[PDB]
């Protein structure tokens, strides 16, 4: 037996559905300010920074050996300044050995030595 499927056209409105813009794409008469905050979609620090930078089309430099989850007070940080966000994060993250900063539209994550404050 053979059931040769002959090429048949579909029905609907995908062909007639055209995408274009007669008016302006996005008229926003205000200085857009993205709020950098921890969300229930990141899960880990890496993913959080990824989303943060991605939204503003910025780059990320994760120089950490592994990806860690949010310590807790991260979601309590909600600022429109990426520089301030990193500044606040690095303050509470320092205890974990993580220092985040922003340089040249790039987020740089560097580990800080806080395992032994009285070492030789």
* Backbone gaps in the chain, preceding residues (C–N over 2.5 A): none
- Answer yes or no: are the C-beta atoms of 70 and 42 closer than 8 Å: yes
Neighbours of 120 (CB within 10 A): 3
Which residue from 53, 54, 88 is spatially nearest to 73, judged by alpha carbons?
88
Sign of the torsion angle spanned by Cα atoms 13, 16, 18, 22: negative
Cβ neighbours of residue 51 closer than 8 Å, sequence gap 6 or more: 39, 41, 42
Beta bridge partners of 62: 109
- Answer yes or no: are the C-beta atoms of 76 and 106 closer than 8 Å: no
User: At residue 41, what are phi and psi to the nearest 5 degrees?
Assistant: -110, -15
- Answer yes or no: are the C-beta atoms of 65 and 12 closer than 8 Å: no
* d(C-alpha 106, C-alpha 86), whole Å: 11
Structure tokens at 21: 């813009």
- Answer yes or no: are the C-beta atoms of 44 and 53 closer than 8 Å: no
Listed in order, strand segments (DSSP E) in the chain are 59-62, 98-102, 106-111
Neighbours of 111 (CB within 10 A): 14
- Answer yes or no: are the C-beta atoms of 116 and 70 closer than 8 Å: no
Which residue from 75, 115, 120, 76 is spatially nearest to 98, judged by alpha carbons?
115
Query: Strand 106-111 to strand 98-102: parallel, antiparallel, or no bridges (unpaired)?
Result: antiparallel
Domain span at 100: 33-113
CATH number at residue 58: 3.55.50.70
The single-letter DSSP state of residue 95 is G
Helix then strand then coil, in percent of the chain rounded to 5, is: 20, 15, 60
- Answer yes or no: are the C-beta atoms of 103 and 63 closer than 8 Å: no
């Amino acid at each position: 037996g053979s059931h040769m499927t002959k090429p048949a056209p579909d029905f609907g409105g995908r062909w007639k559905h055209v995408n274009h813009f007669d008016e302006a794409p996005t008229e926003i008469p205000l200085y857009t300010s993205y709020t950098y905050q921890a969300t229930p979609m990141d899960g880990t620090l890496k993913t959080m920074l990824e989303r943060w930078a991605a939204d503003s089309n910025m780059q990320l430099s994760y120089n950490l050996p592994s990806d860690y989850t949010l310590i807790g007070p991260v979601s309590a940080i909600s600022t429109t300044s990426v520089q301030q966000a990193a500044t606040e994060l690095s303050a509470v993250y320092a205890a974990q050995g993580v220092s985040v900063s922003v340089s040249a539209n790039k987020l740089l994550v560097q580990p800080v030595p806080v395992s032994s404050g009285a070492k030789l």
